[PDB]
Each structure stands twice: as C-alpha cells, then as structure tokens.
Amino acid sequence: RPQVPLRPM
Amino acid sequence: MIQRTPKIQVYSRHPAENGKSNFLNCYVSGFHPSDIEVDLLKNGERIEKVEHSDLSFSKDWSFYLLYYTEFTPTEKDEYACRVNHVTLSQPKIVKWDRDM
Amino acid sequence: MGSHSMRYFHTSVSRPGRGEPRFISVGYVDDTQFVRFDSDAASPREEPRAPWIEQEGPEYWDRNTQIYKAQAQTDRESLRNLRGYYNQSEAGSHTLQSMYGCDVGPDGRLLRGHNQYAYDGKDYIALNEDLRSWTAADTAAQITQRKWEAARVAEQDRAYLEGTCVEWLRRYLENGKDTLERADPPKTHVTHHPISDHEATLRCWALGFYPAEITLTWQRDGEDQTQDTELVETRPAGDRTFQKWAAVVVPSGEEQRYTCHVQHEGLPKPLTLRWEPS
C-alpha cells in the first residue's frame, strides 16, 4: 500500500 | 533539458506460425519525456484495437510502455510499429521480423 | 537470493494550457505490477492490475485512492515550486518522477528502503540508505532538503519503509505466492542465419522466463565476447514473462567454437548451448 504524502518540494 | 530517444522492439508473444493467433508487441523504452505516440500497422494501415501498459519507468528514470494487439500472422502480411516522440524529426517505423 | 521488493513509481507531467498536471502511479512487487492510479481517468481510483490483489476489501481501495489524490495535489505544488527554483517559465512542460519502497530478504526482514525523485529526468533528491538523511543534486534540491529536514520528513519515510512497506509486502507475497514466489526458467534455443558466404549469425534465445533478471552470454573458445555480442533489452511478452536474445556474427565453419551461457533463478543449473544443425 502507498505512503501518505508529507510535504511538497 | 534531458531528452532521450525511444528504443523500439517489435516482436510476437509466442513464436510465430502462419495462421495461428498470437499477440503482436511493440516495446518502447529508454525515452524521456513521457509523451509518445505509437501505432501498430498491418500492411501500412493503423490497427485500431491496440492497447498499452500503464506508464512506468526504469532505474535511470527513462520510460517504457508495451503496446500490443491480437493478431494472426500469415506468410505475406507485413506488420510494423510506428513511433513518434519529440526526439524524432519524423516518425520511426520498425518492421516486425519474426526471428527478432 | 530469495529477496523481494515493493516499489511505487509516480509520474507527474505539467501541460500548460491543457489542464493540471497528470498524475500516474503504478505499484510493483518485483517484476509484477499490481495496482495503478491515473488522474485522467473518468473516475480516478486505485485499480487492481494482478489477480491476487483483488481480494483486498473496499476500505483498501478507498484509502489508497484518497492517498493518490493527496499525492497528486502534493506533486502539483512540488512542480510549481520546482519551476521557481530553476527560474523556469510557466509555458513549458516539466516532469516530476518519484520512486519509493522496500526490499526484504527471504525471512521478510528489511534489507534496504528507497525514496527518491527526479525532475526533468535528472536526479533531484534522494533519501539516503540510512533512512535519516538526504542527498541533494544541486542548489534547488538543497532548498527541498532544508524544508524536509525542518519538517522531519525522513522520520516519517523511515517509519513507512520499516513498518507498512515491509508488512504489506509480506502480505502480498503470501497472497500472490503462486506467482510472486515462482521463478519460471527460460526456454532456450540457438538459431543460425548465414549472412554471406563467410559469416553467419548465431542467436541465443531465452523465452518465457520470470523474473526479468537473466544473463545471456556468448563465448568463443570459452572467452566472453562482450564487445562482439548484440544484446537486446529484456522485453515483456505480455503474459507476465520476459524475453531476451544475444547474437554474434561468426566465421562460417567456426560455429562449434561458440557457446551460449544462460543463468536464471529458475534453472537448477546454468545452461551451456551450442548450435546443433539438424
């Protein structure tokens, strides 16, 4: 299962 | 920026035998950016029922896609894959060779 | 080696004048794709791409769908910020790619984790093998690095890679074992094609194998012919299996000095093949 996104670049 | 031209292979899923149904594949790889147009051709004419794999890429970030269709090869029908990409000044046509 | 990997591969491509950037994600276990998501689909949803994932319940698909929708939005912000970090105009198309996931051994334990990115086909930033620190490619990626240190991003990425990634990979392996833990050996043959009165091509074929990793070499009098072997890229057959060939042009009459050597996980032992004219 995919990872929750955290912060943009 | 980085542009990389597609490698192109055209081949069958199983060894060809005239009159036996099979799949015709066109594998485009090693390219960047991801925008690419691919047609499979039977005696020069675009085949309509052609599907492709979901876009993915290699460890070096270059893209790859498999385009494919069901076909029944015969002695005289010629098949090919026609590819256009921003790296090509005209579309590239690669003929199916049953031994490659 | 008995090892396995799970990877997610994301592609975000801007297209000024033609909407918001497209987001595509695909997920793999080893050489087997098992899920996709595409923001341009009519009703974007995580979708199954292998049979053994279909059993997962609606909460799985719903939750993952929400994750990809969040990831697309995060990538769109990333693209905007990257354009500024490189002083680029708003008129051109750009690409952000992401790779992440875990490798485990035969016992299911973490061997290595991965979380890295490329912009316009060039490495941008990568989580180091320690899962604690970053490597930035240039002064733009140093801004990302500073932001991600300040937000403790690496700690979160580590927790995913050591925890969820491993645990879900183990489940996938156990649910898809009949295919994912099955190596199919190559079917092999050598063909011979005269090119002139004095030369012929020997082509060594490997068909029907899984996983993709294979080594096909030609030797002449037992010396590797690295420089004189035409090797095609390993290519998908479309039925989960892969294909590859290696060819050498040899002097007519000297075919018997050439041997094709084949190594693959599915073989009890490496193969040595010669052209056998029937």
Tab-separated table of C-alpha atoms in Angstrom:
chain	number	residue	atom	x	y	z
A	1	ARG	CA	0.000	0.000	0.000
A	2	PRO	CA	1.198	3.502	-0.842
A	3	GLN	CA	2.632	6.030	1.625
A	4	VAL	CA	0.708	9.117	2.766
A	5	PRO	CA	2.316	12.221	1.219
A	6	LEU	CA	4.083	14.565	3.553
A	7	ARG	CA	5.450	17.841	2.158
A	8	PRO	CA	5.913	19.245	-1.291
A	9	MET	CA	9.367	20.049	-2.659
B	1	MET	CA	16.710	19.590	-20.622
B	2	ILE	CA	17.235	15.858	-20.909
B	3	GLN	CA	15.662	14.173	-23.911
B	4	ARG	CA	16.205	10.532	-24.671
B	5	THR	CA	15.018	8.812	-27.831
B	6	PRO	CA	12.957	5.600	-27.615
B	7	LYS	CA	14.398	2.170	-28.215
B	8	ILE	CA	11.887	0.148	-30.206
B	9	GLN	CA	11.350	-3.608	-30.350
B	10	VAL	CA	8.643	-5.338	-32.399
B	11	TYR	CA	8.040	-8.971	-31.753
B	12	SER	CA	5.438	-11.621	-31.028
B	13	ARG	CA	4.424	-13.039	-27.680
B	14	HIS	CA	4.837	-16.626	-28.929
B	15	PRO	CA	6.970	-17.908	-31.803
B	16	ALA	CA	5.022	-17.087	-34.973
B	17	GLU	CA	3.215	-19.700	-37.009
B	18	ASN	CA	1.251	-18.703	-40.018
B	19	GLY	CA	-2.415	-18.912	-39.326
B	20	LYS	CA	-2.188	-19.237	-35.550
B	21	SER	CA	-3.439	-16.451	-33.342
B	22	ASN	CA	-0.806	-14.660	-31.297
B	23	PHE	CA	-0.002	-11.181	-29.947
B	24	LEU	CA	1.998	-8.509	-31.684
B	25	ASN	CA	4.042	-6.366	-29.305
B	26	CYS	CA	5.796	-3.017	-29.694
B	27	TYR	CA	8.007	-2.257	-26.718
B	28	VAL	CA	9.194	1.339	-26.444
B	29	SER	CA	11.761	2.075	-23.766
B	30	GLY	CA	14.532	4.315	-22.695
B	31	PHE	CA	12.725	7.543	-23.567
B	32	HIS	CA	12.193	10.939	-21.909
B	33	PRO	CA	9.914	12.878	-21.754
B	34	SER	CA	6.972	10.521	-21.436
B	35	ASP	CA	4.778	11.906	-24.281
B	36	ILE	CA	4.869	9.331	-27.124
B	37	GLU	CA	2.547	8.147	-29.927
B	38	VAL	CA	2.649	4.561	-31.030
B	39	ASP	CA	0.737	2.817	-33.809
B	40	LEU	CA	0.843	-0.802	-34.854
B	41	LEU	CA	0.499	-1.266	-38.638
B	42	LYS	CA	-0.745	-4.091	-40.852
B	43	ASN	CA	0.340	-3.614	-44.453
B	44	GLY	CA	0.861	0.066	-43.759
B	45	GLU	CA	-2.551	0.719	-42.149
B	46	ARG	CA	-3.119	1.607	-38.489
B	47	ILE	CA	-4.598	-1.239	-36.442
B	48	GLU	CA	-7.462	0.101	-34.259
B	49	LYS	CA	-7.714	-2.325	-31.430
B	50	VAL	CA	-4.359	-1.688	-29.722
B	51	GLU	CA	-3.834	-1.498	-26.018
B	52	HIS	CA	-0.955	-0.476	-23.869
B	53	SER	CA	0.557	-0.951	-20.431
B	54	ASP	CA	0.406	1.636	-17.679
B	55	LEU	CA	3.250	4.170	-17.762
B	56	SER	CA	6.245	3.119	-15.717
B	57	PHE	CA	9.934	3.800	-15.729
B	58	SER	CA	13.387	2.247	-15.215
B	59	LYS	CA	16.039	2.869	-12.545
B	60	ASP	CA	17.523	5.522	-14.779
B	61	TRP	CA	14.162	7.314	-14.891
B	62	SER	CA	13.586	6.542	-18.596
B	63	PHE	CA	10.051	5.476	-19.546
B	64	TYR	CA	8.756	2.278	-21.025
B	65	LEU	CA	5.473	1.095	-22.493
B	66	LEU	CA	4.255	-2.125	-24.130
B	67	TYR	CA	1.702	-1.674	-26.915
B	68	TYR	CA	0.054	-4.830	-28.113
B	69	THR	CA	-2.728	-6.381	-30.165
B	70	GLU	CA	-4.054	-9.828	-31.006
B	71	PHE	CA	-3.033	-10.958	-34.476
B	72	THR	CA	-2.869	-13.948	-36.764
B	73	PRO	CA	0.291	-13.795	-38.819
B	74	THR	CA	0.423	-15.117	-42.340
B	75	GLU	CA	3.204	-15.553	-44.928
B	76	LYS	CA	2.550	-12.278	-46.794
B	77	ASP	CA	1.103	-9.729	-44.205
B	78	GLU	CA	3.704	-7.217	-43.080
B	79	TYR	CA	3.470	-5.764	-39.567
B	80	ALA	CA	5.250	-2.783	-38.110
B	81	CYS	CA	5.357	-0.299	-35.249
B	82	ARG	CA	5.409	3.455	-35.948
B	83	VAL	CA	6.680	5.740	-33.146
B	84	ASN	CA	6.764	9.484	-32.769
B	85	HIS	CA	8.390	11.385	-29.939
B	86	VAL	CA	9.841	14.886	-29.587
B	87	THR	CA	13.329	13.487	-30.209
B	88	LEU	CA	12.420	12.318	-33.750
B	89	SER	CA	12.300	14.714	-36.660
B	90	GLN	CA	9.887	12.241	-38.331
B	91	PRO	CA	8.026	9.130	-37.077
B	92	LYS	CA	10.178	5.998	-36.925
B	93	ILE	CA	8.898	2.763	-38.420
B	94	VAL	CA	10.250	-0.577	-37.325
B	95	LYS	CA	9.149	-3.685	-39.261
B	96	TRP	CA	8.306	-6.943	-37.448
B	97	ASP	CA	10.912	-9.636	-38.115
B	98	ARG	CA	9.639	-12.987	-36.859
B	99	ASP	CA	13.234	-14.012	-35.975
B	100	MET	CA	13.968	-10.923	-33.750
C	1	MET	CA	18.965	-14.766	-3.009
C	2	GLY	CA	15.161	-15.236	-2.101
C	3	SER	CA	14.726	-11.447	-1.825
C	4	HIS	CA	11.730	-9.350	-2.918
C	5	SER	CA	10.875	-5.665	-3.455
C	6	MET	CA	7.853	-3.426	-3.480
C	7	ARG	CA	8.019	-0.214	-5.439
C	8	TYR	CA	5.638	2.637	-6.257
C	9	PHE	CA	6.533	4.686	-9.384
C	10	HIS	CA	4.854	8.113	-9.745
C	11	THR	CA	4.911	10.351	-12.804
C	12	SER	CA	3.573	13.955	-12.753
C	13	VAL	CA	3.697	15.878	-16.006
C	14	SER	CA	2.668	19.531	-16.415
C	15	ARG	CA	0.911	20.635	-19.537
C	16	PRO	CA	0.337	24.368	-19.620
C	17	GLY	CA	-2.834	25.316	-21.421
C	18	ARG	CA	-4.139	21.720	-21.157
C	19	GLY	CA	-5.179	21.449	-17.517
C	20	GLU	CA	-3.498	20.458	-14.332
C	21	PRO	CA	-0.524	18.159	-14.325
C	22	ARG	CA	-1.340	14.499	-14.963
C	23	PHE	CA	-0.513	12.129	-12.088
C	24	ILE	CA	0.081	8.435	-12.722
C	25	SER	CA	1.148	5.912	-10.128
C	26	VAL	CA	1.872	2.255	-10.601
C	27	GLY	CA	2.831	-0.256	-7.923
C	28	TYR	CA	5.031	-3.338	-8.325
C	29	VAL	CA	6.104	-6.404	-6.385
C	30	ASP	CA	9.365	-7.488	-8.068
C	31	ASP	CA	8.569	-7.539	-11.825
C	32	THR	CA	4.841	-7.817	-11.357
C	33	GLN	CA	2.638	-4.691	-11.476
C	34	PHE	CA	-0.333	-4.981	-9.150
C	35	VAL	CA	-2.044	-1.552	-8.922
C	36	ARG	CA	-2.438	1.743	-10.864
C	37	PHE	CA	-3.958	5.163	-10.490
C	38	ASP	CA	-4.425	7.770	-13.187
C	39	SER	CA	-5.737	11.287	-12.581
C	40	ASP	CA	-7.050	11.471	-16.162
C	41	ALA	CA	-9.365	8.513	-15.742
C	42	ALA	CA	-13.045	9.179	-15.757
C	43	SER	CA	-13.354	8.440	-12.014
C	44	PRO	CA	-9.817	8.215	-10.731
C	45	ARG	CA	-9.441	5.242	-8.370
C	46	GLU	CA	-6.754	2.818	-7.416
C	47	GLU	CA	-7.340	-0.170	-9.651
C	48	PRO	CA	-6.158	-3.810	-9.450
C	49	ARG	CA	-3.622	-4.982	-12.065
C	50	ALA	CA	-2.872	-8.512	-10.728
C	51	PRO	CA	-5.378	-11.144	-9.595
C	52	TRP	CA	-4.087	-11.599	-6.061
C	53	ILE	CA	-4.758	-8.017	-5.032
C	54	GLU	CA	-8.462	-8.204	-5.969
C	55	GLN	CA	-9.346	-9.763	-2.600
C	56	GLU	CA	-8.487	-6.627	-0.694
C	57	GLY	CA	-11.695	-5.044	0.668
C	58	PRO	CA	-13.303	-1.679	-0.193
C	59	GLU	CA	-11.540	0.105	2.650
C	60	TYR	CA	-8.194	-0.704	0.936
C	61	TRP	CA	-9.136	0.749	-2.396
C	62	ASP	CA	-10.909	3.744	-0.790
C	63	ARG	CA	-7.994	4.649	1.469
C	64	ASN	CA	-5.401	4.231	-1.264
C	65	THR	CA	-7.477	6.347	-3.650
C	66	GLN	CA	-7.519	9.188	-1.120
C	67	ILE	CA	-3.695	8.816	-0.799
C	68	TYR	CA	-3.089	9.138	-4.544
C	69	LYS	CA	-5.402	12.137	-4.781
C	70	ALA	CA	-3.347	13.779	-1.972
C	71	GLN	CA	-0.118	12.775	-3.677
C	72	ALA	CA	-1.245	14.376	-6.968
C	73	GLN	CA	-2.005	17.609	-5.185
C	74	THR	CA	1.378	17.453	-3.406
C	75	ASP	CA	3.158	16.814	-6.712
C	76	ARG	CA	1.352	19.812	-8.314
C	77	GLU	CA	2.620	22.045	-5.547
C	78	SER	CA	6.097	20.478	-5.978
C	79	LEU	CA	6.014	21.230	-9.727
C	80	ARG	CA	5.103	24.852	-9.110
C	81	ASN	CA	7.908	25.220	-6.599
C	82	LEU	CA	10.463	23.478	-8.900
C	83	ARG	CA	9.668	25.861	-11.704
C	84	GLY	CA	10.587	28.713	-9.377
C	85	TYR	CA	13.721	27.013	-8.020
C	86	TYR	CA	15.003	26.834	-11.644
C	87	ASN	CA	13.715	30.249	-12.810
C	88	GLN	CA	11.630	28.483	-15.468
C	89	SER	CA	8.749	29.983	-17.380
C	90	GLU	CA	5.191	28.901	-16.898
C	91	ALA	CA	4.930	27.957	-20.624
C	92	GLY	CA	6.943	24.718	-20.749
C	93	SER	CA	6.039	21.165	-19.654
C	94	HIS	CA	8.013	19.540	-16.859
C	95	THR	CA	8.128	16.126	-15.278
C	96	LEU	CA	8.456	15.031	-11.628
C	97	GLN	CA	9.095	11.376	-11.022
C	98	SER	CA	9.195	9.534	-7.666
C	99	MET	CA	10.368	6.011	-6.732
C	100	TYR	CA	9.929	4.547	-3.278
C	101	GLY	CA	9.606	1.254	-1.431
C	102	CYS	CA	11.390	-1.557	0.332
C	103	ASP	CA	13.500	-4.617	-0.271
C	104	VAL	CA	13.247	-7.621	2.033
C	105	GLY	CA	15.095	-10.865	2.374
C	106	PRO	CA	13.829	-14.438	2.430
C	107	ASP	CA	12.955	-14.012	6.095
C	108	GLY	CA	10.865	-10.940	5.499
C	109	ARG	CA	13.305	-8.554	7.171
C	110	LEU	CA	14.142	-5.139	5.661
C	111	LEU	CA	17.281	-5.106	3.511
C	112	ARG	CA	17.000	-1.572	2.251
C	113	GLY	CA	14.483	1.246	1.796
C	114	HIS	CA	14.224	3.835	-1.049
C	115	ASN	CA	12.616	7.232	-1.530
C	116	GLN	CA	13.889	9.378	-4.331
C	117	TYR	CA	12.964	11.813	-7.053
C	118	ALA	CA	13.913	13.162	-10.496
C	119	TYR	CA	12.951	16.417	-12.223
C	120	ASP	CA	13.009	16.567	-15.960
C	121	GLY	CA	14.749	13.166	-15.995
C	122	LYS	CA	17.584	14.191	-13.709
C	123	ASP	CA	18.109	13.003	-10.163
C	124	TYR	CA	16.891	15.683	-7.779
C	125	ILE	CA	16.828	14.425	-4.192
C	126	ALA	CA	17.121	11.014	-2.507
C	127	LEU	CA	16.667	9.550	0.949
C	128	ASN	CA	19.988	8.044	1.944
C	129	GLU	CA	20.293	4.331	2.810
C	130	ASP	CA	20.269	5.302	6.483
C	131	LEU	CA	16.629	6.483	6.059
C	132	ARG	CA	17.651	9.573	8.054
C	133	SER	CA	19.457	11.995	5.792
C	134	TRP	CA	19.194	13.329	2.249
C	135	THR	CA	21.371	13.746	-0.845
C	136	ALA	CA	20.519	16.824	-2.917
C	137	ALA	CA	21.701	17.111	-6.523
C	138	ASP	CA	22.062	20.932	-6.689
C	139	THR	CA	21.186	24.206	-5.048
C	140	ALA	CA	17.466	23.882	-5.856
C	141	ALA	CA	17.324	20.406	-4.225
C	142	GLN	CA	19.126	21.933	-1.208
C	143	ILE	CA	16.022	24.089	-0.633
C	144	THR	CA	13.862	20.949	-0.659
C	145	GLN	CA	16.376	19.295	1.665
C	146	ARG	CA	16.235	22.185	4.176
C	147	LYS	CA	12.364	22.119	4.146
C	148	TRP	CA	12.209	18.350	4.572
C	149	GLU	CA	14.792	18.427	7.462
C	150	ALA	CA	12.780	21.125	9.204
C	151	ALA	CA	9.569	19.096	8.822
C	152	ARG	CA	11.252	15.787	9.859
C	153	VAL	CA	10.132	14.108	6.612
C	154	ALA	CA	12.843	11.440	6.736
C	155	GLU	CA	11.493	10.107	10.128
C	156	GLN	CA	8.085	9.574	8.590
C	157	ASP	CA	9.512	7.989	5.431
C	158	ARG	CA	11.587	5.647	7.642
C	159	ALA	CA	8.532	4.658	9.656
C	160	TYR	CA	6.671	3.774	6.425
C	161	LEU	CA	9.620	1.871	4.919
C	162	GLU	CA	10.343	-0.165	8.098
C	163	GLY	CA	6.693	-0.724	9.050
C	164	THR	CA	3.877	-0.529	6.466
C	165	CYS	CA	6.041	-1.210	3.433
C	166	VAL	CA	7.520	-4.421	4.835
C	167	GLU	CA	4.314	-5.609	6.369
C	168	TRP	CA	2.203	-5.125	3.245
C	169	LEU	CA	4.877	-6.589	1.003
C	170	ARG	CA	4.894	-9.733	3.188
C	171	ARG	CA	1.112	-9.947	2.854
C	172	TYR	CA	1.282	-9.527	-0.955
C	173	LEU	CA	3.926	-12.240	-1.179
C	174	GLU	CA	1.871	-14.578	0.878
C	175	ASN	CA	-1.412	-13.841	-1.141
C	176	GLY	CA	0.323	-13.971	-4.551
C	177	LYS	CA	2.830	-16.708	-3.684
C	178	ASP	CA	1.894	-18.991	-6.541
C	179	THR	CA	3.221	-16.429	-8.974
C	180	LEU	CA	5.344	-13.996	-6.970
C	181	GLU	CA	7.476	-16.729	-5.375
C	182	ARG	CA	7.630	-18.851	-8.553
C	183	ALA	CA	10.609	-18.466	-10.951
C	184	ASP	CA	9.819	-19.716	-14.431
C	185	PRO	CA	13.029	-20.747	-16.257
C	186	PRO	CA	13.797	-19.681	-19.743
C	187	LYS	CA	13.047	-21.870	-22.712
C	188	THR	CA	16.193	-21.639	-24.797
C	189	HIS	CA	17.339	-22.282	-28.343
C	190	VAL	CA	20.067	-21.220	-30.771
C	191	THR	CA	19.377	-20.199	-34.293
C	192	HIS	CA	21.774	-19.907	-37.224
C	193	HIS	CA	21.400	-17.467	-40.172
C	194	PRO	CA	24.119	-17.227	-42.878
C	195	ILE	CA	24.726	-13.597	-43.740
C	196	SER	CA	27.273	-14.159	-46.500
C	197	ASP	CA	29.476	-16.920	-47.778
C	198	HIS	CA	31.958	-16.296	-44.971
C	199	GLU	CA	29.806	-15.262	-41.925
C	200	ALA	CA	26.732	-16.409	-40.037
C	201	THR	CA	24.728	-15.043	-37.095
C	202	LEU	CA	24.250	-17.244	-34.078
C	203	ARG	CA	21.337	-16.023	-31.938
C	204	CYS	CA	20.761	-17.376	-28.419
C	205	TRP	CA	17.128	-17.047	-27.305
C	206	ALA	CA	15.554	-17.051	-23.879
C	207	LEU	CA	11.717	-17.085	-23.740
C	208	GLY	CA	9.001	-17.411	-21.163
C	209	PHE	CA	11.051	-16.522	-18.035
C	210	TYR	CA	10.154	-14.801	-14.761
C	211	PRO	CA	11.574	-12.698	-13.085
C	212	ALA	CA	13.257	-10.481	-15.683
C	213	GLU	CA	16.868	-10.753	-14.367
C	214	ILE	CA	18.826	-13.054	-16.719
C	215	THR	CA	22.367	-13.296	-18.055
C	216	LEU	CA	22.923	-14.439	-21.621
C	217	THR	CA	26.488	-14.528	-22.866
C	218	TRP	CA	28.363	-15.878	-25.906
C	219	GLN	CA	31.868	-17.376	-25.526
C	220	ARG	CA	34.323	-18.171	-28.293
C	221	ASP	CA	36.775	-20.872	-27.112
C	222	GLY	CA	35.433	-20.124	-23.636
C	223	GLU	CA	36.328	-16.372	-23.806
C	224	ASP	CA	33.433	-13.930	-23.317
C	225	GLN	CA	32.594	-11.993	-26.439
C	226	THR	CA	31.402	-8.899	-24.706
C	227	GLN	CA	32.284	-6.451	-27.386
C	228	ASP	CA	31.043	-8.549	-30.262
C	229	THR	CA	27.659	-9.576	-28.802
C	230	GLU	CA	24.451	-7.780	-29.857
C	231	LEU	CA	22.221	-7.957	-26.871
C	232	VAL	CA	18.648	-6.739	-26.908
C	233	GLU	CA	16.996	-5.241	-23.859
C	234	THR	CA	14.993	-7.773	-21.851
C	235	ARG	CA	11.389	-7.310	-23.023
C	236	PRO	CA	7.906	-8.227	-21.677
C	237	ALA	CA	5.924	-10.861	-23.536
C	238	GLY	CA	2.621	-9.609	-22.101
C	239	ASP	CA	1.785	-12.808	-20.162
C	240	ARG	CA	3.973	-11.892	-17.130
C	241	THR	CA	7.093	-13.473	-18.785
C	242	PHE	CA	10.139	-11.864	-20.410
C	243	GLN	CA	12.241	-12.477	-23.499
C	244	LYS	CA	15.838	-11.775	-24.462
C	245	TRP	CA	18.351	-12.704	-27.165
C	246	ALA	CA	22.089	-12.383	-27.691
C	247	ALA	CA	23.672	-12.625	-31.140
C	248	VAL	CA	27.195	-12.955	-32.523
C	249	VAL	CA	28.445	-12.915	-36.087
C	250	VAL	CA	30.878	-15.756	-36.555
C	251	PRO	CA	33.132	-17.142	-39.293
C	252	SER	CA	31.346	-19.886	-41.245
C	253	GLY	CA	32.834	-23.138	-40.244
C	254	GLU	CA	33.755	-21.939	-36.720
C	255	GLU	CA	30.278	-22.240	-35.137
C	256	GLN	CA	31.324	-25.044	-32.883
C	257	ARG	CA	33.794	-22.783	-31.073
C	258	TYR	CA	30.882	-20.698	-29.757
C	259	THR	CA	28.838	-21.434	-26.643
C	260	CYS	CA	25.799	-19.567	-25.260
C	261	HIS	CA	25.646	-19.412	-21.483
C	262	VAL	CA	22.376	-18.788	-19.646
C	263	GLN	CA	21.884	-18.019	-15.955
C	264	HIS	CA	18.489	-17.545	-14.385
C	265	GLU	CA	16.938	-18.066	-10.941
C	266	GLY	CA	14.541	-20.719	-12.338
C	267	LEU	CA	17.305	-23.004	-13.581
C	268	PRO	CA	18.620	-25.936	-11.444
C	269	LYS	CA	21.946	-25.094	-13.069
C	270	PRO	CA	23.302	-22.666	-15.741
C	271	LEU	CA	22.962	-23.759	-19.301
C	272	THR	CA	25.589	-24.063	-21.964
C	273	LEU	CA	24.053	-24.245	-25.503
C	274	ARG	CA	25.569	-24.713	-28.966
C	275	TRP	CA	24.158	-24.563	-32.388
C	276	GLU	CA	23.066	-28.074	-33.298
C	277	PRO	CA	22.406	-28.226	-37.031
C	278	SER	CA	19.573	-30.721	-37.543
